[model samples]
Target: GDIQKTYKDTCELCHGADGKGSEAGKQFGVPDFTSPDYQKSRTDAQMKESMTNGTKNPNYVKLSDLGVDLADLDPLVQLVRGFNGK
Candidate 1:
């Protein structure tokens, strides 16, 4: 499946189409993937953990619950990390 498709199905609801933070994303303090601060502050390993272990937002949809194999998350990692410098 497409990484962008997974985001549309799950993340875009909060993270916004442009990685700028949606209404719910903001209130929930979702990290904007495009933020320079985030790109700097978040380590590659940290981002991977956040993808797996979850994050600050309670509204966050955990990866495991989505029924996606944990092994396949690399694409999603790149999808969000690709937002860097965009």
Candidate 2:
């Protein structure tokens, strides 16, 4: 669906297909977006917090760096949770 692509343009490269993560993503420790166990541990608010502020890792680009509006994060959070593979 179009909603799924929301993450595609912005995050799909590292997150991988279905947010499963790529070879480099794993080497870099990027979390798998499709993991139920992982997904269940975080709330949408918390997820957004990470996305907005960004994680401290290989190269975590924060919303501020991306020049993406904070408001756009809402759909991203939902897209992540909505695609839970658990």
Candidate 3:
């Protein structure tokens, strides 16, 4: 439930409820998470780092300071991976 709620409240604005890239995502040139090319380009660790540290080129917001525990990182990563099926 935390995973779903987190995504709905935060990620969905850019990633879409299905991770297909929302309008804002398109505006910001966010990658399609479901893309084999995109998914293949990132490892789990890389994904975690990006989510935690944020990116400058695309100006992604870092989420680590928002109270997400390290314990939840794996599930959050898995949640992102789940988008691959969409």
CA lDDT of each candidate?
0.80, 0.75, 0.81
Task: Specify the highest-TM-score model's number.
Answer: 3
Ranked by TM-score, the better of candidates 1 and 3 is 3
Error of model 1, residue 86, in angstroms: 2.9
User: Best-fitting candidate, measured by lDDT?
Assistant: 3
Please report the TM-score between candidate 1 and the true structure.
0.80
lDDT digits (tens) for residues 40-74 of candidate 3:
89999998888778877655766776566667788
For 1-86, candidate 2 gives per-residue lDDT tens digits of: 65465566667777776678888677667888788999999998888878877876547777668666676788778877866984
lDDT of 1 by residue, 1-86 (tens): 57778788877878888888889889877777887788889787887887798877677777897777787688877788778877
- Stretches off by above 4 angstroms in model 2 are 1-3
Candidate 1 local Cα displacement, residue 50, angstroms: 1.7
Score every model by TM-score. Answer: 0.80, 0.79, 0.84
